[PDB]
Design a protein around this ligand. Sequence first.
Ligand SMILES: Nc1ncnc2c1ncn2[C@@H]1O[C@H](COP(=O)(O)OS(=O)(=O)O)[C@@H](OP(=O)(O)O)[C@H]1O
Ligand SMILES: Nc1ncnc2c1ncn2[C@@H]1O[C@H](COP(=O)(O)OS(=O)(=O)O)[C@@H](OP(=O)(O)O)[C@H]1O
Ligand SMILES: Nc1ncnc2c1ncn2[C@@H]1O[C@H](COP(=O)(O)OP(=O)(O)O)[C@@H](O)[C@H]1O
Ligand SMILES: Nc1ncnc2c1ncn2[C@@H]1O[C@H](COP(=O)(O)OP(=O)(O)O)[C@@H](O)[C@H]1O
Ligand SMILES: [Mg+2]
Ligand SMILES: [Mg+2]
Lengths: 205, 205
Amino acid sequence: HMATNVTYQAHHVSRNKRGQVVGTRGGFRGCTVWLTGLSGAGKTTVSMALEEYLVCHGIPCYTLDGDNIRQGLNKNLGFSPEDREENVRRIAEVAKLFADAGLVCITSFISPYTQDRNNARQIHEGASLPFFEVFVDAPLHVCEQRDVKGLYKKARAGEIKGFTGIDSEYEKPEAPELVLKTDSCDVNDCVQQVVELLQERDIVP
Amino acid sequence: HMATNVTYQAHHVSRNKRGQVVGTRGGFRGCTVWLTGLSGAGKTTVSMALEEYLVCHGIPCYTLDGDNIRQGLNKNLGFSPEDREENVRRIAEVAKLFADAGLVCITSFISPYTQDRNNARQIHEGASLPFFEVFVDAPLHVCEQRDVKGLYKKARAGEIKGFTGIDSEYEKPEAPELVLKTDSCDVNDCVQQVVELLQERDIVP
Ligand SMILES: Nc1ncnc2c1ncn2[C@@H]1O[C@H](COP(=O)(O)OS(=O)(=O)O)[C@@H](OP(=O)(O)O)[C@H]1O
Ligand SMILES: Nc1ncnc2c1ncn2[C@@H]1O[C@H](COP(=O)(O)OS(=O)(=O)O)[C@@H](OP(=O)(O)O)[C@H]1O
Ligand SMILES: Nc1ncnc2c1ncn2[C@@H]1O[C@H](COP(=O)(O)OP(=O)(O)O)[C@@H](O)[C@H]1O
Ligand SMILES: Nc1ncnc2c1ncn2[C@@H]1O[C@H](COP(=O)(O)OP(=O)(O)O)[C@@H](O)[C@H]1O
Ligand SMILES: [Mg+2]
Ligand SMILES: [Mg+2]
C-alpha cells in the first residue's frame, strides 16, 4: 500500500509550450480554483457557472466536482474523516495534473478540513501552480433551508450519518483567496468575483 | 468505503464547446491513448515523445505515467495485484476526465491485467470517449537487457519482489488497437505509428 522503487519520469514539453497549445489565448494559465464549503453553499453552482464562463471566454478549464468524482475515481471512498482526507488528497493530485496540463482546474468539493486544503495547496505550490482557495460561504442555516438534495433532512432524522455541518466537522477557511457570500449574491456575481480574482492573478487576461 | 448519497452534477459546457476552446485546431478530440507493456518495453519513451509530438502539432495532451502517478495520486498503492488493479482503475478514471476535458490523455502504465485494461476501456466507452490500447511490445529478454532503472537486476536477485515479468504476471494484449514493436523500431517510428492510428481515428487531422 505504498509505491516503492518508482522513479520520476520527466515530460519532454515545457510549461511555456503547453501554454502555447492550450486554448486560443496565449500564455500558460494552469491553476486550481479550489472551492470549499458546506453542502448547499453553492459550490457546484459556482464551479459549473465558472467553467461555462471560462470556456465562453476562450479558457480551457475543467470542473472536478465532489459528487461526480465520488461516482468514479473516488467511488471507493465514504465520508469518515479518513475517507474525506483521501478523497481530497486524490483530487488535489488530479487537480494538479489538470493545472500542469494548462487547464484552469476548478474543484467543488466540501473539503471540510483545513489541513487537507492546505495539503492540496502545497501540492500545487511545490509544482509552481497557482492555487486559489475560494470559500463558498453560506450560513449553515441557509444551506439547510436550501436542502437541495434532501440531505440535511435525512441527516437531521439520523438517516445519513456523518453529514458535514450536522454530524461531521466543517473547518471554516481562515485564509482563503476569496470568500463568496452566496446567500447575498447571485451566481453570476459570484462568478464575477472569481473572475476578478483570476484577472488579478494573471490567469484570466 | 463506498460513496453513498451522491448525485451527478451536470456540466454547463458541452463536448462541442470544449472542442472549440481546447486547441487552436477546432473540433473535440478528447481520447485516451493507453499504453501497456513490460517494464523497459518503452512506454514512457513513447508516451513522452507522443506528448511532445502532439503539443508540437497543436494538440493539447497530457501524459499520465505509472512511475509519476505512483508518486502523487497513487503513492499509497504498491504492486500487489489488487493494488495494481486500484492503480489502473484510478488512472482510467483520471484519463476519462482528461479526455472528457478535450485533451489527448496518454497513459504509460504497465497495466499488466487484461481485465483492468478492459475496465479502463469500458469507462471510456461509457463516456463516448475514444480509447486506444497500445501494446508496447518488446520481448522480456530485451527489456531485461535494457534495464535502465536496474529493476530487473534487482528483481532477479529478489531485491524487488513481485516485479512484472519476473515475479508478477503480464497478460499480453490480445486485441490492442496498435502494437509497438520497440525492439525493432526507434521511438520516432513508434511515435509515427501512434500518430498514424490517431489520424485513422480522426484524433489528429
Ligand atoms: N455525509 C456526507 N457529508 C457530506 N456530503 C455528503 C455526505 N453524504 C453524501 N454527501 C454528498 O457528497 C457530496 C460531498 O462530497 P465531497 O467529496 O465534496 O465531500 S468531501 O470533500 O470529501 O468532504 C455532497 O455534495 P455537496 O452538497 O455539493 O457538498 C453530498 O451530495
Ligand atoms: N514490482 C514492480 N513491478 C513493476 N514495476 C515496478 C515494480 N516496483 C516498482 N516498479 C516501478 O513502477 C513502475 C510500474 O508502475 P505502473 O503503475 O506502470 O505499474 S502497474 O500498471 O500498476 O502494473 C515501473 O515502471 P516501468 O519501468 O515504466 O514499467 C517501475 O519503475
Ligand atoms: N450566489 C450563489 N452561488 C451559488 N449558488 C447559489 C447562489 N445563490 C443561491 N444559490 C443556490 O444555492 C444552492 C446550492 O446548491 P449547490 O450548487 O448544489 O451547492 P453545493 O455544491 O455547495 O452543495 C443552489 O440551489 C443554488 O441555486
Ligand atoms: N522504441 C525504442 N527503441 C529503442 N530503445 C527504446 C525504445 N523505447 C524505449 N527505449 C529505451 O529503453 C529503455 C526503457 O524505456 P522506458 O521508456 O523507460 O520503458 P518503460 O516506461 O516501458 O519502462 C530506455 O533506456 C529507453 O531509452
Ligand atoms: Mg455540490
Ligand atoms: Mg515507464
